[PDB]
Fold this sequence. Notes:
The structure is cut from a larger assembly and holds chains A and B.
Chain A: H1 9-43
Chain B: no helix or strand
Amino acid sequence: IARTFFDAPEKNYERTMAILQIESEKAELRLKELEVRRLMRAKGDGPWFQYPTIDKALIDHSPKATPDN
Amino acid sequence: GWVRPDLGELSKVTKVKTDRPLPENPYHSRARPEPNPEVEGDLKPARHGSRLFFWTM
C-alpha cells in the first residue's frame, strides 16, 4: 500500500518546506506593499499617486504688446 | 534732407547695438523644486503572480 499509493515522507516534507517558503515571501511582499503605499501617499515623491497638473508647454514666451508681463 | 518712410517701413523688426547685459533672471524667481525621479531598469515579471489572496497566478 505504501509503495503503490502513498506519498513518501521525504516528498511531503520538502513540499511543505517549499510551500512555507513561497507563502512567507508573499506575506513579506504584502506587508511591504502596505508600508510602501502608506509612505507614498503620505509623501508624494513616488510614481504612484501622481495627480495631474498644468503642463508648461502651454506657456507662450513670445514678446507681448505690453512690456509688463 | 529727411525722407518720409513708405508703407510698412516703420513696422519692420530691427536690431539694436546695445551694451547692457542680458538679465539672466528677469522675473525675480527662485530655485525650481526638484522633479521626481524617473523609471529605470528592465521590466522584470511579477514575483509569485499577482499575490492577491489565494490566487497563485
